[PDB]
Amino acid sequence: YVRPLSVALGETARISCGRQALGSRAVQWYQHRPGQAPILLIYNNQDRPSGIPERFSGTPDINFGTRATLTISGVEAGDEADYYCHMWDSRSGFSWSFGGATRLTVLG
Amino acid sequence: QVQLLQSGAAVTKPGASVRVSCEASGYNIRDYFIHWWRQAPGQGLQWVGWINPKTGQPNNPRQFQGRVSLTRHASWDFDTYSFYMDLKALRSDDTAVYFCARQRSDYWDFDVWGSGTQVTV
Amino acid sequence: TLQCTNVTNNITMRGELKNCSFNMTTELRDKKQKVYSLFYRLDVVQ
Amino acid sequence: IIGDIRQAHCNVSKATWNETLGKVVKQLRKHFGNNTIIRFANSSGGDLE
Amino acid sequence: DIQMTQSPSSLSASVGDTVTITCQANGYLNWYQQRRGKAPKLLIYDGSKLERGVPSRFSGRRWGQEYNLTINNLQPEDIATYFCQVYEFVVPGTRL
Amino acid sequence: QVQLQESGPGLVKPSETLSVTCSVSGDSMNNYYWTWIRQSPGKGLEWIGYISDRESATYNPSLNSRVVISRDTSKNQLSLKLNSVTPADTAVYYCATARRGQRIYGVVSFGEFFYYYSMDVWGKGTTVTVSSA
Ligand SMILES: *[C@@H]1O[C@H](CO)[C@@H](O[C@@H]2O[C@H](CO)[C@@H](O[C@@H]3O[C@H](CO[C@H]4O[C@H](CO[C@H]5O[C@H](CO)[C@@H](O)[C@H](O)[C@@H]5O)[C@@H](O)[C@H](O[C@H]5O[C@H](CO)[C@@H](O)[C@H](O)[C@@H]5O)[C@@H]4O)[C@@H](O)[C@H](O[C@H]4O[C@H](CO)[C@@H](O)[C@H](O)[C@@H]4O[C@H]4O[C@H](CO)[C@@H](O)[C@H](O)[C@@H]4O[C@H]4O[C@H](CO)[C@@H](O)[C@H](O)[C@@H]4O)[C@@H]3O)[C@H](O)[C@H]2NC(C)=O)[C@H](O)[C@H]1NC(C)=O
Ligand SMILES: *[C@@H]1O[C@H](CO)[C@@H](O[C@@H]2O[C@H](CO)[C@@H](O[C@@H]3O[C@H](CO[C@H]4O[C@H](CO)[C@@H](O)[C@H](O)[C@@H]4O)[C@@H](O)[C@H](O[C@H]4O[C@H](CO)[C@@H](O)[C@H](O)[C@@H]4O)[C@@H]3O)[C@H](O)[C@H]2NC(C)=O)[C@H](O)[C@H]1NC(C)=O
Ligand SMILES: *[C@@H]1O[C@H](CO)[C@@H](O[C@@H]2O[C@H](CO)[C@@H](O)[C@H](O)[C@H]2NC(C)=O)[C@H](O)[C@H]1NC(C)=O
Ligand SMILES: *[C@@H]1O[C@H](CO)[C@@H](O[C@@H]2O[C@H](CO)[C@@H](O)[C@H](O)[C@H]2NC(C)=O)[C@H](O)[C@H]1NC(C)=O
Ligand SMILES: *[C@@H]1O[C@H](CO)[C@@H](O)[C@H](O)[C@H]1NC(C)=O
Ligand SMILES: *[C@@H]1O[C@H](CO)[C@@H](O)[C@H](O)[C@H]1NC(C)=O
Ligand SMILES: *[C@@H]1O[C@H](CO)[C@@H](O)[C@H](O)[C@H]1NC(C)=O
Ligand SMILES: *[C@@H]1O[C@H](CO)[C@@H](O)[C@H](O)[C@H]1NC(C)=O
Ligand SMILES: *[C@@H]1O[C@H](CO)[C@@H](O)[C@H](O)[C@H]1NC(C)=O
Ligand SMILES: *[C@@H]1O[C@H](CO)[C@@H](O)[C@H](O)[C@H]1NC(C)=O
C-alpha cells in the first residue's frame, strides 16, 4: 500500500509517516529508487551518515508529543523514490515491518 | 482462658523443611510479643527469636539467619492468631523440642508457654 | 470480577501494571457499562 | 499513560551516605565495645509497610 | 554485655530444709521451674516480685549483682529444674 | 570501507531448496551485523531476519521460521537456506549490514532501554523468478 505525494519545484517536501509513537521514538528514513539500492538518510532522528548533503533533516525526540517529519529543502528531479518510516518505539516492541512507502512525485 | 495451642510432632529427613504452629486465643495478641525457644535433650534452653504480632518483623541471632523464617497469620475478626516457624535446611543436631513463649512486660516475663513440639531428622 | 491483561510488550518489570476491565453500575440502576482502568500488581489478586 | 512506562525510584548521594553512616558507627561504639564489628543488613520480613 | 555464672551445679538435699541457689547477672532476671519433658513455668520475676498462682513458699531477694531463690518447706511435688533467665541468655539450671 | 556484492541462481523450481550467497570484502565480521531484505513488486520492503556475532540467529515471526542462515570466517561467505518454497517469491534480494544502536530513555540499571537496528551500507542484489517451465 503506497501513497502518492506531489511537490513542485521551489518549495519543500514534508513527509510524515502514519505510524504514531507511543513514547520515546527513534525512526529511520530511507530512500529506495526502483532498481537501485536503498539509501539510509536519517538515523536517531537527527543524524546524517557520510554521503548525504544539507538537504534532508529530521525532527528530534525532545518534548515528546510531536510527530516524525522528514523535511527536504530543495527538490530534485532524481528524487522519484519511495520514502519509508522505520518507526522504533519503546512500547511497540521489536519492529519487523518497514511500514508504508510514500511515492513522492515531482511536477514540471 | 489465656492458652497457646501447640501443633503435633513431625519426623523429617536431613534437608527437608518443617513447620511448627502456635495459636493464641484468649487475650489481646497485638500488644504482646511471641518468642520461640528450643532445648536439646540433655542441655538447656536456647533462644530462637521473637516476632511482632502487630507488624510482623522477626528477629533472629547470627546462628539462625537464613534458615528460620518466623511468620504469623491473623483471622478476619482478629481474636485468634497462627504463629508459624519454618526451618529451611535442618541439620543433624536439630533434633529438639520447640516452645511458644509470650512476653508479658519489659522484664521479659514468659508466663504462658506451649505444650512443645519435638522434631527429629 | 475483573479481566486484567498485561501492558508491557517487551518482557525483561513486565507485570507491574494491569489493564483490567469490568462491569460498573450506571447512574440509572437498570443498565451497566463496561469500563476499563489500570491497576497495580499489589492491588489485585487472582 | 502518555509516554514511556517507567519505574518509580529514589536517589541518595553515595558520598553523603557513607559520611552520614560513618558518624552513626562512631556514636554506636559508645554503648558497645571499642573494637567491635558493626554491620548493617536489610529488613528481615513482615508486611510491606 | 551480659555475664552469667551458675555455681550450684548439682545439689540433692532432703525435704524440710532451706536451700538457696544463686546466679550473678546484670539486668532483669526471672526464675523458672522446669520438669522433665514439660514446659517451664514462671515462679518469680524482676528478682523479688511474685507471680499470681505460685504458692507463698517461694521467695527471692537481690543485693547488688547476686540473686537468691529461697526454698523453704519443700514438698514431694517441688523437685524440678530451676534456672535464672536474662532476656536471650538461659544457663542450664540444676536439679534437686 | 566495506563492499558488498552477491550472486544468485536466478532460476528456481517450486518445492525445491534455495541458496543465495553474498560475498563481502574490505573488512572482517568482527563488529558487522548482517541481515536479509526482500522486496516484491507491488509492496514495500520486507525484513525477514538477521544474524548476530555470537551465532544467535533470530528471524521474522510472520514467516514462522522457514529460513535459516549461516556464515563463517574461513570462507567469508554468508548464505540462506529455504525449504518448501511457496510460489510467491517473485522478488529481489538485498545483502546489507546493520548497526546495533541503543536508545536509552530511562534508568540504565532498570533495563529501560531498547535496541534499534539501522542499515548503513547496502548491496546491489539480484532477483529470482519461480517459473513452471
Ligand atoms: C536517579 O539517578 C539515576 C542514575 O542512577 C538517574 O537516571 C538517569 O536518568 C536519565 C534521565 O532521567 C537518563 O538519561 C537519558 O539518557 C540518555 C543517554 O544519555 C547518554 O547517551 C547520549 C548518546 O551517547 C551517544 O554518544 C556517546 C558519546 O557522547 C557515544 O559513546 C554513544 O555510543 C552514543 O553514540 C549522550 O549524548 C549523553 O550525554 C549527555 O551526557 C553528557 C555527559 O553527562 C552531557 O554533557 C550532555 O549534555 C548530555 O546530557 C548520555 O551519555 C539520553 O539520550 C536521554 O536523552 C533523551 O531522550 C529523552 C526521551 O524523552 C529526551 O526527552 C531527551 O531530550 C533526550 O533526547 C535525546 O537523545 C536522543 C538520542 O541521542 C536523540 O535521538 C533525541 O533527539 C534527543 O536529542 C537531544 O538533546 C540533546 C541535548 O544535549 C542533544 O545533545 C541531542 O543531540 C538531541 O538533540 C536521557 O537524557 C540516564 O540514562 C539515566 N542513567 C544513568 C545516568 O546511568 C535518574 O534520572 C535519577 N533520578 C532523579 C529523580 O534524580
Ligand atoms: C534483603 O537482602 C537479601 C540478600 O541481599 C535478599 O535476598 C534474596 O531475596 C530474593 C527475593 O526472594 C531471592 O530471590 C529469589 O529466590 C527464590 C528462592 O530461590 C532459589 O533461587 C535463588 C536464586 O534466585 C537461589 O539463591 C536460592 O538458593 C534458590 O535456589 C526464587 O523462588 C525467586 O524466584 C522468583 O523469581 C523468578 C524469576 O527469576 C520468578 O519466575 C518466580 O516466579 C519467583 O517470582 C527468586 O529467584 C534471593 O535468592 C535471596 N538471596 C539470598 C542470598 O537469600 C532479600 O530479598 C532482601 N530483602 C528485601 C526486603 O529487600
Ligand atoms: C482474603 O483474600 C485473600 C486473597 O487470597 C486471602 O489471602 C491469602 O491467604 C492464602 C491462604 O493462607 C494464602 O495462600 C495467600 O498467599 C494469601 N494472599 C496474600 C496476598 O497474602 C485472605 O486470607 C482472605 N482473608 C481471609 C480472612 O481469609
Ligand atoms: C458484563 O456482563 C455481561 C453480561 O451482562 C457479561 O457478558 C457475558 O459473559 C459470559 C461469561 O462467560 C458469556 O458467556 C456471555 O456470552 C457474555 N455475554 C455478552 C453479551 O457479552 C460480561 O462478560 C461482563 N463483563 C465482564 C468484564 O465480565
Ligand atoms: C503477563 O505477564 C506475566 C509475566 O510476564 C505472565 O505470567 C502472564 O501470563 C501474562 N499475562 C498475559 C495475559 O499475557
Ligand atoms: C536532588 O534534586 C535537586 C534539584 O531538584 C538537586 O539540586 C540535587 O543535587 C539532587 N540530589 C540528588 C542526590 O540527586
Ligand atoms: C564509604 O565511602 C568512603 C569514601 O571515602 C570509604 O572510605 C568507605 O570505605 C566506604 N564504606 C564502605 C562500607 O564501603
Ligand atoms: C574506648 O575509646 C574511647 C575513645 O573515645 C576512650 O575514651 C575509652 O577510654 C575507650 N575505652 C576503654 C575501655 O579503653
Ligand atoms: C544468698 O545465699 C547464699 C547461700 O546460698 C548466702 O551466702 C548469701 O549471703 C545470700 N545472699 C543474699 C543477698 O541473701
Ligand atoms: C535498662 O534495664 C536495666 C535492667 O535490665 C536497668 O538496670 C537499667 O536502668 C535500664 N536502663 C534505662 C535507661 O532505663
mmCIF file of C-alpha atoms and ligand atoms in Angstrom, chain E residues 20 61 63 66 68, ligand 9:
data_model
loop_
_atom_site.group_PDB
_atom_site.id
_atom_site.type_symbol
_atom_site.label_atom_id
_atom_site.label_comp_id
_atom_site.label_asym_id
_atom_site.label_seq_id
_atom_site.Cartn_x
_atom_site.Cartn_y
_atom_site.Cartn_z
ATOM 1 C CA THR E 20 19.178 -21.462 98.172
ATOM 2 C CA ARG E 61 15.793 -11.152 97.013
ATOM 3 C CA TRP E 63 21.742 -7.398 96.685
ATOM 4 C CA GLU E 66 23.539 -11.558 93.435
ATOM 5 C CA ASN E 68 18.891 -15.687 95.601
HETATM 6 C C1 LIG G 9 22.378 -15.973 99.077
HETATM 7 O O1 LIG G 9 22.568 -17.304 99.594
HETATM 8 C C2 LIG G 9 23.929 -17.609 99.937
HETATM 9 C C3 LIG G 9 23.955 -19.058 100.367
HETATM 10 O O2 LIG G 9 23.183 -19.871 99.494
HETATM 11 C C4 LIG G 9 24.416 -16.653 101.023
HETATM 12 O O3 LIG G 9 25.784 -16.920 101.307
HETATM 13 C C5 LIG G 9 24.251 -15.210 100.563
HETATM 14 O O4 LIG G 9 24.596 -14.321 101.619
HETATM 15 C C6 LIG G 9 22.810 -14.947 100.127
HETATM 16 N N1 LIG G 9 22.671 -13.592 99.620
HETATM 17 C C7 LIG G 9 21.617 -12.815 99.890
HETATM 18 C C8 LIG G 9 21.638 -11.444 99.285
HETATM 19 O O5 LIG G 9 20.689 -13.201 100.593
#
